[PDB]
Amino acid sequence: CMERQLEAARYRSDGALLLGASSLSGRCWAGSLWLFKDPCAAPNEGFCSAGVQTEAGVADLTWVGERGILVASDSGAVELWELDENETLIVSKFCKYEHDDIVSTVSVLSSGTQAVSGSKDICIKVWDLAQQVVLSSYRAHAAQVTCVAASPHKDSVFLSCSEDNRILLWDTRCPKPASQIGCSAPGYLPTSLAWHPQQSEVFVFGDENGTVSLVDTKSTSCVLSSAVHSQCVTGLVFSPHSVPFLASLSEDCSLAVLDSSLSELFRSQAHRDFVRDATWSPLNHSLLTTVGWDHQVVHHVVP
Amino acid sequence: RVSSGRDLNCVPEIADTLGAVAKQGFDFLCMPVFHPRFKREFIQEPAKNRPGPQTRSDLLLSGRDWNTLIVGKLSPWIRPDSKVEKIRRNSEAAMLQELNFGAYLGLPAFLLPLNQEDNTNLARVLTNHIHTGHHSSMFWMRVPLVAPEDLRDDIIENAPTTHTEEYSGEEKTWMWWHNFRTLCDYSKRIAVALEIGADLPSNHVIDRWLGEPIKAAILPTSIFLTNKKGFPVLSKMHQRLIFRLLKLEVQFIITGTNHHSEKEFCSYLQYLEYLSQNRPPPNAYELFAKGYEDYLQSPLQPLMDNLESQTYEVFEKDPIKYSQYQQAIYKCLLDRVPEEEKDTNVQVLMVLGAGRGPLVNASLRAAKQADRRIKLYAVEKNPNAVVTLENWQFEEWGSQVTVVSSDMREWVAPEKADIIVSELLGSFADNELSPECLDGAQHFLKDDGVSIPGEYTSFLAPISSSKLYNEVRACREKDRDPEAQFEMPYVVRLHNFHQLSAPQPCFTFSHPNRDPMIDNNRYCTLEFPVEVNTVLHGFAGYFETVLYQDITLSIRPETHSPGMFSWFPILFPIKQPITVREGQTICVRFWRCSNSKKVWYEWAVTAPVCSAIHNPTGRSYTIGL
Ligand SMILES: Cc1cc(NC(=O)C(=O)N2C[C@@H](C)CC[C@@H]2c2ccccc2)cnc1N
Numbered sequence: 001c002m003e004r005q006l007e008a009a010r011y012r013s014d015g016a017l018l019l020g021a022s023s024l025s026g027r028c029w030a031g032s033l034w035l036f037k038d039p040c041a042a043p044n045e046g047f048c049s050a051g052v053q054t055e056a057g058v059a060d061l062t063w064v065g066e067r068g069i070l071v072a073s074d075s076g077a078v079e080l081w082e083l084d085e086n087e088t089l090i091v092s093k094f095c096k097y098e099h100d101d102i103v104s105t106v107s108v109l110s111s112g113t114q115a116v117s118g119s120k121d122i123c124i125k126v127w128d129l130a131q132q133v134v135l136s137s138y139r140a141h142a143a144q145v146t147c148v149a150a151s152p153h154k155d156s157v158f159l160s161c162s163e164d165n166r167i168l169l170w171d172t173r174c175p176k177p178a179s180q181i182g183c184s185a186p187g188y189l190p191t192s193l194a195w196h197p198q199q200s201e202v203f204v205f206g207d208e209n210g211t212v213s214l215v216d217t218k219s220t221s222c223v224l225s226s227a228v229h230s231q232c233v234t235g236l237v238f239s240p241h242s243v244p245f246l247a248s249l250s251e252d253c254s255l256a257v258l259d260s261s262l263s264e265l266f267r268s269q270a271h272r273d274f275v276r277d278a279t280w281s282p283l284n285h286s287l288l289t290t291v292g293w294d295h296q297v298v299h300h301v302v303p
Numbered sequence: 304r305v306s307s308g309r310d311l312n313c314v315p316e317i318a319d320t321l322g323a324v325a326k327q328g329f330d331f332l333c334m335p336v337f338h339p340r341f342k343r344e345f346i347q348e349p350a351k352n353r354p355g356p357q358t359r360s361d362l363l364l365s366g367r368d369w370n371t372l373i374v375g376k377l378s379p380w381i382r383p384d385s386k387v388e389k390i391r392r393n394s395e396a397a398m399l400q401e402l403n404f405g406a407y408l409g410l411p412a413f414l415l416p417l418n419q420e421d422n423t424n425l426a427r428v429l430t431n432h433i434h435t436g437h438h439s440s441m442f443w444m445r446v447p448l449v450a451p452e453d454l455r456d457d458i459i460e461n462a463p464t465t466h467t468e469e470y471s472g473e474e475k476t477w478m479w480w481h482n483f484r485t486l487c488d489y490s491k492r493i494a495v496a497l498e499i500g501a502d503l504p505s506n507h508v509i510d511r512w513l514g515e516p517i518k519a520a521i522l523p524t525s526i527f528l529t530n531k532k533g534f535p536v537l538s539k540m541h542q543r544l545i546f547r548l549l550k551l552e553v554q555f556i557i558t559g560t561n562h563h564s565e566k567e568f569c570s571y572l573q574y575l576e577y578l579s580q581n582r583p584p585p586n587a588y589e590l591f592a593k594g595y596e597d598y599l600q601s602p603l604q605p606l607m608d609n610l611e612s613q614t615y616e617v618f619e620k621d622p623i624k625y626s627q628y629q630q631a632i633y634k635c636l637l638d639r640v641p642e643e644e645k646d647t648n649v650q651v652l653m654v655l656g657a658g659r660g661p662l663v664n665a666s667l668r669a670a671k672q673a674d675r676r677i678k679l680y681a682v683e684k685n686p687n688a689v690v691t692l693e694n695w696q697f698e699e700w701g702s703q704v705t706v707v708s709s710d711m712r713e714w715v716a717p718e719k720a721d722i723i724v725s726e727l728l729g730s731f732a733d734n735e736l737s738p739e740c741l742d743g744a745q746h747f748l749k750d751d752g753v754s755i756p757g758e759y760t761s762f763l764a765p766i767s768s769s770k771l772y773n774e775v776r777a778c779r780e781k782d783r784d785p786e787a788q789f790e791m792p793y794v795v796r797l798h799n800f801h802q803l804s805a806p807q808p809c810f811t812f813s814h815p816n817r818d819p820m821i822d823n824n825r826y827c828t829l830e831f832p833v834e835v836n837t838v839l840h841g842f843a844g845y846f847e848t849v850l851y852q853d854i855t856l857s858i859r860p861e862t863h864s865p866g867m868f869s870w871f872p873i874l875f876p877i878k879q880p881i882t883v884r885e886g887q888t889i890c891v892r893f894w895r896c897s898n899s900k901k902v903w904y905e906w907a908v909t910a911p912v913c914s915a916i917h918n919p920t921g922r923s924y925t926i927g928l
Pocket residue numbers: 600601602603605617618726727728729730735794868869870871872
């Protein structure tokens with residue numbers, strides 16, 4: 001019962017590497033969470049620091065502080081897994097079945113005490129991670145929720161996008177908490193979201209046609225957009241750098257790295273199936289780690 | 304009881320899962336046949352050359368289990384009507400692949416969503432698969448009462464939900480189904496899986512799905528309220544809709560996760576059980592007709608043809624109908640023969656079409672009840688039934704009854720009748736030619752004689768049934784007009800249909816008919832006000848008859864004789880369905896036509912659009928004289 005489809009890769013503050021994996025084919029359709037204190041040793045199971053089996057697949061993943069792992073299950077559950085005091089084991093803390101279909105996306109809020117999940121049931125939920133209960137449930141979209149992304153510094157603010165062709169800016173302090181923003185007219189469906197690390201007020205969204213767009217929330221007009229990929233943009237991750245780089249992932253099996261004006265600086269074809277996630281090393285800010293359905297963990301050096 | 308399946312979109316181990324749902328009490332499982340999240344490339348390298356296996360093995364279940372227990376589900380990423388060309392082309396190839404795997408496994412049904420307005424390419428690809436070898440498999444189109452967009456929380460500040468009457472818009476989901484099914488040419492392999500939300504729409508939105516081929520109703524765990532004990536239950540309006548659906552013997556599918564944590568997953572199902580067991584049980588008519596729902600039969604012609612033994616047997620198993628004939632003869636005998644003449648005045652009583660004698664016996668029961676003397680002739684041209692009559696006459700009746708083995712239009716009667724009694728009525732009253740038969744027998748009724756029945760009237764009503772339209776369509780036969788099946792009536796216990804307007808009288812006949820100029824031909828125009836959006840597939844026909852004074856028979860639904868099962872309604876189809884909008888008038892025209900040899904019906908719709916004249920000159924359907 002092994003899992004070869006790599007879904008998620010997230011570097012912890014101290015440089016350790018978190019992997020989420022699904023079996024999407026064969027007898028068992030399950031999933032697994034791994035921790036690699038040596039990042040170069042991955043994805044080889046024998047030289048892991050910790051591992052565990054899940055009941056079902058993992059569609060998305062995120063750190064919760066330093067020991068916590070928050071999982072978007074195929075089962076409809078959101079799961080919180082804690083780390084052992086010695087970080088040898090990975091034990092389940094809570095598994096709550098509150099979505100009616102696949103949970104596709106999760107995002108931790110700035111506080112670190114709350115999170116938001118998006119599902120194929122079209123719903124979005126806000127979670128209390130101490131009380132293990134749903135605070136709010138929102139049916140704002142008319143189709144599956146592709147992506148939810150917490151504002152970096154405001155607990156009440158986060159983005160969402162959906163196959164209903166809506167990008168919603170959320171503020172839970174407003175009686176009507178969602179607001180529709182984007183380009184002037186008919187977009188190709190939004191597929192990925194990334195807040196700017198420095199500017200509260202700006203973000204990027206990738207579309208299903210391969211375009212990457214820079215958006216100002218206030219101006220609600222697409223500043224820039226470039227044809228980066230030949231297929232769907234599945235992820236967008238800003239580097240930790242003072243003037244940050246943008247990494248874009250695609251079903252076209254390529255990594256691109258872009259500047260603030262969305263010009264192409266780097267491009268890797270090393271993957272020979274879809275590219276699912278990316279994290280920048282917090283130790284070496286020029287190191288970028290990608291994982292994909294070809295079970296490859298590639299470590300790129302970025303000029 | 305209830306046949307019901309579990310919906311899952313997550314199956315780690317098909318053995319363990321199927322075993323869990325069986326224990327829970329489910330009859331079948333709707334599940335993915337490829338992993339829902341496993342998008343596949345068919346055109347671009349390198350993803351195209353992804354190593355296999357592409358899904359789990361057919362060896363994991365018995366052929367029996369695939370054939371009976373598993374409904375396939377189309378992967379949610381498959382979007383043949385995407386605005387992106389690469390996603391259309393890839394979804395085309397992926398749809399064929401998933402459907403072809405379904406056929407490979409011999410699955411009884413495959414689920415596909417209608418979740419947007421444009422499903423043209425989806426329909427083209429399904430239609431292409433359907434015409435790739437004749438297979439049995441069903442396609443269940445998953446469509447909601449209410450579109451998600453029209454159900455959303457009113458929580459987008461700069462995009463509010465409209466609080467205004469949108470009559471046609473609230474029906475948008477039916478038009479999604481209608482357009483898909485039309486594109487696919489009304490294939491009998493494409494049915495509806497109707498999905499039901501937390502808040503039901505207006506009734507008119509529900510009534511749209513009357514006459515539609517609903518094989519499944521999908522109930523999400525969300526819509527279940529909670530009670531004192533903790534048990535999942537439904538709103539009284541949800542219970543109403545279930546009761547409607549139970550009469551369409553649909554399959555119930557439970558979808559979503561167990562929100563009633565403290566209670567098991569038997570409970571949800573146990574509620575539906577509780578609901579089906581605690582409905583109003585079947586009455587005498589429903590229990591009788593249970594097997595006949597929407598079964599098309601050609602109308603009997605007891606004049607041109609000799610009915611079988613077993614056909615008379617069902618005619619005679621109708622005690623309400625013969626009670627009414629007895630009472631009509633009882634009241635007639637008292638009006639014609641005064642008390643002080645009871646010993647002297649013997650009335651001449653003639654049964655015209657006596658079969659195996661049930662009216663003969665009702666005539667004797669009547670005379671013994673009214674305490675009046677009668678003389679019976681039993682007239683029957685079916686010489687097979689005449690055998691039954693003559694054994695009765697020698698064994699029990701004696702010389703009171705004279706059996707006459709001949710046509711009532713030829714028989715030289717020795718004396719005239721006080722009363723002629725007959726039962727020559729079809730489902731459309733005059734469609735067995737009672738008028739022509741009793742006309743030819745009139746000359747041997749006394750100048751002041753009574754026909755029982757004295758009067759009958761046919762009724763028509765426009766109906767919608769995409770289900771019966773398909774049943775008629777499938778009555779094509781070699782060596783005749785390809786469209787002949789649309790130009791002839793059927794006797795049917797109409798079940799899956801919508802009555803679009805109140806029945807109205809079509810044709811009336813009076814007996815005796817004293818008129819110097821007897822013409823049994825007829826031309827009638829009917830205007831039917833329709834107050835819904837719908838589709839016209841034909842006209843339901845019924846009749847009422849006066850036996851004597853206030854004693855009557857009726858199969859017109861509003862006045863239907865209670866507990867009488869001798870007659871089902873008749874159906875006049877039309878060749879091409881007709882769109883009818885709310886507010887519009889359906890105008891139909893019916894003719895009764897004749898020559899020496901044949902009687903027939905012709906008909907036409909003249910509004911809101913014209914049909915062809917159906918059955919011109921009796922080319923497809925005639926009733927023999
Ligand atoms: C007494 C009488 C009765 C009838 N009744 C009917 O035809 C009729 O509605 N049904 C439907 C069902 C009740 C089974 C018998 C018969 C039927 C059988 C097989 C082919 C079609 C029809 C007609 N005419 C007369 N005279």
